[PDB]
Amino acid sequence: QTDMSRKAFVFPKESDTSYVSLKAPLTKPLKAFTVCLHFYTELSSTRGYSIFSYATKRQDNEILIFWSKDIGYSFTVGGSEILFEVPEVTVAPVHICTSWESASGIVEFWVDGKPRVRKSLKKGYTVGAEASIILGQEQDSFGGNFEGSQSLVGDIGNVNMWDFVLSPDEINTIYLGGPFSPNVLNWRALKYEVQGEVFTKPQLWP
Amino acid sequence: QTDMSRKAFVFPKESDTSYVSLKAPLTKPLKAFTVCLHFYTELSSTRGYSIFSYATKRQDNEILIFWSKDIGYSFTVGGSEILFEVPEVTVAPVHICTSWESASGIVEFWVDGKPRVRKSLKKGYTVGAEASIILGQEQDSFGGNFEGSQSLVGDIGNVNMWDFVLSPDEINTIYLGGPFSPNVLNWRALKYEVQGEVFTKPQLWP
Amino acid sequence: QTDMSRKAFVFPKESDTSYVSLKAPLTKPLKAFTVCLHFYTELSSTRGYSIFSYATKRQDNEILIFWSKDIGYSFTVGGSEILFEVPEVTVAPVHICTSWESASGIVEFWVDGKPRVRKSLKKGYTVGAEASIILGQEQDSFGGNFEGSQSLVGDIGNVNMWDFVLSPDEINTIYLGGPFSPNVLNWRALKYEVQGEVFTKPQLWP
Amino acid sequence: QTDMSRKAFVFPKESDTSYVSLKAPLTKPLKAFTVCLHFYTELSSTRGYSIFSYATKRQDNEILIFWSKDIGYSFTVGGSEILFEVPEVTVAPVHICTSWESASGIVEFWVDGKPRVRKSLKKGYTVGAEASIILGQEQDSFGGNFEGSQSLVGDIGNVNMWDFVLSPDEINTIYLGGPFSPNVLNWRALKYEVQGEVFTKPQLWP
Amino acid sequence: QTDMSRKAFVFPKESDTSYVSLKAPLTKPLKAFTVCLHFYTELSSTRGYSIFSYATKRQDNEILIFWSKDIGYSFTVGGSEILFEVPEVTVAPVHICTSWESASGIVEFWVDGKPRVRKSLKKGYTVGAEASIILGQEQDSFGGNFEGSQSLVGDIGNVNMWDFVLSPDEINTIYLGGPFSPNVLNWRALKYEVQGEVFTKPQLWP
Amino acid sequence: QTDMSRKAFVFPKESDTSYVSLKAPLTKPLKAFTVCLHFYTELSSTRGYSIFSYATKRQDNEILIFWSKDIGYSFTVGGSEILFEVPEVTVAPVHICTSWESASGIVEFWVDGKPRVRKSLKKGYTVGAEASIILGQEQDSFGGNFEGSQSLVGDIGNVNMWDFVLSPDEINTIYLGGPFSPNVLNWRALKYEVQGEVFTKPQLWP
Amino acid sequence: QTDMSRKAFVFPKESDTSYVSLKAPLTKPLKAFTVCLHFYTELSSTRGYSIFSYATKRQDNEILIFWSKDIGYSFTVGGSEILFEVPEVTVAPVHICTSWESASGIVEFWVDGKPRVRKSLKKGYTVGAEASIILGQEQDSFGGNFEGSQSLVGDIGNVNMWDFVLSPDEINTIYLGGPFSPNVLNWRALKYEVQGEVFTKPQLWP
Amino acid sequence: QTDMSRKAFVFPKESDTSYVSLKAPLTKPLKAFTVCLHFYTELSSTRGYSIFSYATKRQDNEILIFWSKDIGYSFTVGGSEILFEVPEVTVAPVHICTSWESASGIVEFWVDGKPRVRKSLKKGYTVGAEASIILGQEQDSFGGNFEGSQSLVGDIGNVNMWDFVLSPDEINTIYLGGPFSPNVLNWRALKYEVQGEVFTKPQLWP
Amino acid sequence: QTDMSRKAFVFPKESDTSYVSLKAPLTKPLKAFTVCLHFYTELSSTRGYSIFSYATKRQDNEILIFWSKDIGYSFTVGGSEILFEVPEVTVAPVHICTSWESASGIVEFWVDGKPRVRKSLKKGYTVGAEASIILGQEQDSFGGNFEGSQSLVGDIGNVNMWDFVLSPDEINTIYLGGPFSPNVLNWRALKYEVQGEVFTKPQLWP
Ligand SMILES: [Ca+2]
Ligand SMILES: [Ca+2]
Ligand SMILES: [Ca+2]
Ligand SMILES: [Ca+2]
Ligand SMILES: [Ca+2]
Ligand SMILES: [Ca+2]
Ligand SMILES: [Ca+2]
Ligand SMILES: [Ca+2]
Ligand SMILES: [Ca+2]
Ligand SMILES: [Ca+2]
Ligand SMILES: [Ca+2]
Ligand SMILES: [Ca+2]
Ligand SMILES: [Ca+2]
Ligand SMILES: [Ca+2]
Ligand SMILES: [Ca+2]
Ligand SMILES: [Ca+2]
Ligand SMILES: [Ca+2]
Ligand SMILES: [Ca+2]
């Protein structure tokens, strides 16, 4: 487990080969989760891109966070998709947190510390534990079949995951940088494998 | 009775069946009132929605606070309506307080701590005591006849009601989160009944 | 009827002449009652004081709520007395309710929404209907013989009286603020007479 | 003398009936004046309205402060007009102070503490002392000939008048709140008569 | 007139010479007032200090707010004094408001948004308008005769004064930082002169 | 069976004759049990009192939960005593659960949802099924020989009994009042007999 | 291998014969370790007790965690002792982690997620791996010479051991119960042997 | 430059030889500064210790932050001292910030985000740039003459220095851990030398 | 070597002859660099201009920073170009820092302390040490062939160059003006030669 504090993966070219695969000690199938990350890309006005790709062997889009061009953030669980439309997008680094819960299907999407309206997705589902988590690519088989037109170009980091819905006050601390302890995926205790053109650099954002 | 402090009702799907009914053991009919609430919805650019629906057996729109698409807040008492145009609407949680006084018919509207101009409505009327108070739906009968195209989708909370017109100083206190004692409807002491897909969650707003 | 909402009687000096007399439209003898009031004084560590003095021509302490120095609340009906010991007192406004029922002699005493243990007093007694109800003084005859060392110095308000025992849920709504209608003594519809140095001011408490 | 402090006149419906007439003690003719007031209305996008209408039997527009649609503040003295163009107008309470000095004809117009450029009007004129001062209406005769399309709808208050030009420092105190003593017309010592549907309510602005 | 917003006067050493003199062009003598301020000092356990000194040529203690060691706040008008005993005192900035009304003599005292019990002082008195208002020192003559053993050491700011008794709602607004307009002494519109070692610094309190 | 839900037995006087006897549908001898209740009394600092008195014809203290002054909860099974000492006691309603298992003699004691340390008592013993269960008194014969100095004065309710050790999770749901189904003694299906001055009143605790 | 998840060893009586012996699948002598556990006991105010006794055939206090009465946690490695003093003790379940590194000799001690100051012990030592690990007793030979005056009475569980110093992040995840993999001694894969009066019960603590 | 982020120096034993020497790229003499650090020690109950020692060849205590037993923090500049008395000290990590300004001599002292009252020290002085900055020891000559009785035993970290007084908002960001850029001494870009028995470890505090 | 602190080269006319030539005492070929500068120009609306032209004998655009009209900053290394689109412009002094690194080709570009996204250029290239560095012109031979339509009109200063990629923290200090030491090209130790109409004046930007 490597401490990635202050460091980001840099995907500086559009390619289908550059990815990092993140390994989770996930012994339990998820009835709920939170995932937070920073990313920074100019693609938003050019095309869509994968922000966070989680696949199980049953389902290649088991959790996917996707920027869809001229629409905004696609969020999907279990192949069902919900849109958090963003009309005005700016070239600045952006922090997101996204939370889903099976018991209600309530999705919380948060951008730069501001909540979106809570929406319903995949009530009663469960996310499988045996999963491939990939940054930089959108995967259509378990660990592969990326499309370069869906790759990330630029930076991603502070990828942190919990198997529970963070409260709003917790997510506020995350955005401010208060202390927290992720229990599914910890940027401060990252297990990862790097493939292709990916560089680790000091994070650009504060 | 339940202390809903820091909690909101989440209405995460469009439906004709999700609602909460709030009980007031109100004895005297209302010659005046104030109602204050937080709500959060993205619908404001899509369609109209009921924020706060108070009906009596004579009158289904006995007090109704309604967002009307491309206009703003619609306020009606005893079935008569006045409008507070909102030319720019922005996706953020909004606090509103509204007061009506029979003796003058003056309606007061405050949004996020700012008053609208005092308008006149239903001078000399009296609001019936035997009431059905419904959140998340607009009712066209005493306890029913909802239209799904008028449901609230999103959050409503801090619902407080007084049988008198609050002064501006009091309303400033409410918005700042000073202490107060609502004497008709009280979030700290709420008696309510839930139907359909409705969930109690930590409030998104401070 | 005068609506005393948000107003309190202020007794800002020690005297034996400042009092207010409250006129009850009461003619049936009380087989039970609840009396609730809010009050605020600095005397509690200095000396005892009358909170609520109800006298009948046969009995000057027919209902008396009395603070007794370094003891607590003294509650007495028909001259008999019981104590609700209070080992620590804090300088904040205090709201009390107390209920007595002849059919059981059970006294309930409630301070700031917390019940005291139920105690037995004057089972089968009756409280006279023709009463002199006085605030600010303790009376040893029908409307007179006040002692300045027993006067309330400070504020008293929200004085409500019922000829029946309120349930705990009702007492909770009294404390928190919700709707209620007293049928013996109503703050919203008070009949009172002021004598001496007494002022009506905005209540300090919410 | 009536203290209207913290109170406003409310004109909640369009009519020619609703007006209030203010009585100045003024004996001397005015060689200079300042008039300051708070008003709040949503009409500014819809039609013109009279803000302040000092009239004399010789001259119905002896001093008139008038909102002209899509133009701004019409300021006229002795029937001669000047405009302070306002290209962007926003629905919020607005404080104005206006000064006229005969010895130079200089008009100072101030809005929310910002000066407009000084303009020349009626140099060497004199404003008649025997005057009818009306709020809520524009008068074309010494006490009448109102027109509904010129009536104020909304709130007006803090109407103070001096027979001299306040300095910028003084006007800054008027806007921010400090101590001042008007000698022609004092809101804290006002003589007025109400006609029609006009109400006195707590001012919405600080 | 300086906008002292977010600034405080810092009195960092004991002296008989560091003071600021606050200028009010007050014409009417005061039948009532409210004064509110923040201050911060460690002296409270060591010795008494003047918080707010208002003197006339007739009366050096016309308004004085004083800390008395091991007693608490001393409030005096016209030389007559009342105490608001503070048995536990903590090393933090403290906001106070205090109100006096001649007509009743009622003194209100508020500390960090909690009211003290209303007390009586100098009923029927009138506070002189020609006044010397000094922060940091205690006057024994008009503008002079300071005692270093009574000087404030530390910070004072947000000094606002009204010539009327603020309601509890208003004071709650003040303490919460709601908008308000002081009509005697305005921190946003302060005219003052500084003598000796006194500095303007960013306020330590929110 | 009477549904005692929301009701408590009230023992408002010290007496040797006020008691209720609860009838158990028990048939097997108890090799284990759990007993849970709320009670409320002021005696704790004044004298001991019997909380729960279970006697078989062989053994008057076959299960006894007893408060002993200056010590705490006496728990006895088969006549043998262990103490869960309580140095700091506060006058508030207290919930307890206590469990015993013959297979190990482990006693679990729980106060207000917090476990005491597990202690050992009467391993291999058997509790008789023919039992007089009495609330309000300590019985020294099968159903009698009460003592005034050991009577409960105050309120006892939610008396539930299981013939097995509840897990911590179950006891947590009991403390939260969740769905639970007792099978030796059931408040929601209570067979009982009332003797002397005992009253049924709404429970004071939530 | 037994998964002891949610279970604790209960030592419910004082004895010198009740112990559980834990078998470590280890051969490498330890240059560093971390040990974590929950325990719950009332002894702390009565006497000291062994929490964790690790003995090699040369050294019976090779690692020992010992509560020292009125002092606190004794920690000793290779027979050298350090104390982490705890002046006041609450009767509650307590989680501790302690780490030692030979290279620096730094001892970390953590109670309920709060670190003690790092201290030095046995720099350059090495702990033998051919070790007997006993819970419930202090051992003065490789498997015996227990003293009942040093036995644990109560509960001990979640006993996990690493041959490396856990980071503060990892320890936070232990205390929060996140995922972790012990490599010397694992509660989820415990190999153990029970002697005397010891029971396996559901853990009382979360 | 070494990024010490999340690392602390550990001084686990008392010695007169363990220190870290910090080098500032500072060439202009300081007219103002801010010093912020975390430290963690148990010595505070037991003896005094140096926290931060800044010497110039003319002046061994040109800046000294010192804990003096029973007194509290000693802050000295140019060899003059002021005390920030601390009556009760608890064993927890403490963050401090301290500021000095020549022009006023105002010292700000901040503990765990709470400001002390501003004090005066060395008005008009200046601090030399030819300086030796040592952690862990108190120095009485430019680089040496330590005392073991004044050494820090424990952890020190997050040492940042500015040549200007940080505003209260800035210091609040430092305490919260918002982004900041030092310009004299920078933990993220630290130039230091380690001497004696000292270790670098992950910081125990968040 | 001249200390140019607070000074700037002023190019007050368009010409093909005004330039200043900067000499780097550089011996190693540059595997990486950072260049930071301030410039101020009106040209941005009107035509492109050379900000910083670095040419080796092989390559007249070995490093060039160029404003390209309507596009933004052209950055080119070894004659290959990447664009940082700037769709909105303000006529103000602008600080840029740009870094390149052969080992990845990653270019960083920073404007007024805000990073652009990292882009790849000239991976594995090497930049010749023996170069002419010209401010005010674009150079198409080694030291000449300037085009007036590409000259800088206005101000250039604070030109600092490093042969390594500054971290974000460092670049932040550069923008804030924290202390730094450039090892290729140092404004505070500049070797330069001036040709044509160029002046040195106090820098307009702070
Ligand atoms: Ca795909
Ligand atoms: Ca896919
Ligand atoms: Ca309807
Ligand atoms: Ca409808
Ligand atoms: Ca009496
Ligand atoms: Ca008496
Ligand atoms: Ca007209
Ligand atoms: Ca006219
Ligand atoms: Ca004096
Ligand atoms: Ca004096
Ligand atoms: Ca007995
Ligand atoms: Ca017995
Ligand atoms: Ca041993
Ligand atoms: Ca031993
Ligand atoms: Ca020294
Ligand atoms: Ca020394
Ligand atoms: Ca070229
Ligand atoms: Ca060219």
PDB file of C-alpha atoms in Angstrom, chain H residues 1 25 181-183 186 188, chain I residues 169-170 172-173 176 178-179:
ATOM      1  CA  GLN H   1      14.270  20.881   0.317  1.00  0.00           C
ATOM      2  CA  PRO H  25      16.714  31.277   3.306  1.00  0.00           C
ATOM      3  CA  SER H 181       2.298  29.269   1.481  1.00  0.00           C
ATOM      4  CA  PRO H 182       4.959  30.132   4.082  1.00  0.00           C
ATOM      5  CA  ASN H 183       7.798  32.409   3.022  1.00  0.00           C
ATOM      6  CA  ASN H 186       8.159  25.771   5.153  1.00  0.00           C
ATOM      7  CA  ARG H 188       6.581  21.202   2.883  1.00  0.00           C
TER       8      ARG H 188
ATOM      9  CA  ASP I 169       4.475  24.764  -4.057  1.00  0.00           C
ATOM     10  CA  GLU I 170       7.551  26.461  -5.529  1.00  0.00           C
ATOM     11  CA  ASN I 172       3.082  29.327  -5.747  1.00  0.00           C
ATOM     12  CA  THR I 173       5.992  30.981  -3.908  1.00  0.00           C
ATOM     13  CA  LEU I 176       3.408  35.216  -4.195  1.00  0.00           C
ATOM     14  CA  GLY I 178       8.364  34.064  -1.618  1.00  0.00           C
ATOM     15  CA  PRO I 179      12.140  33.579  -1.640  1.00  0.00           C
TER      16      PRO I 179
END
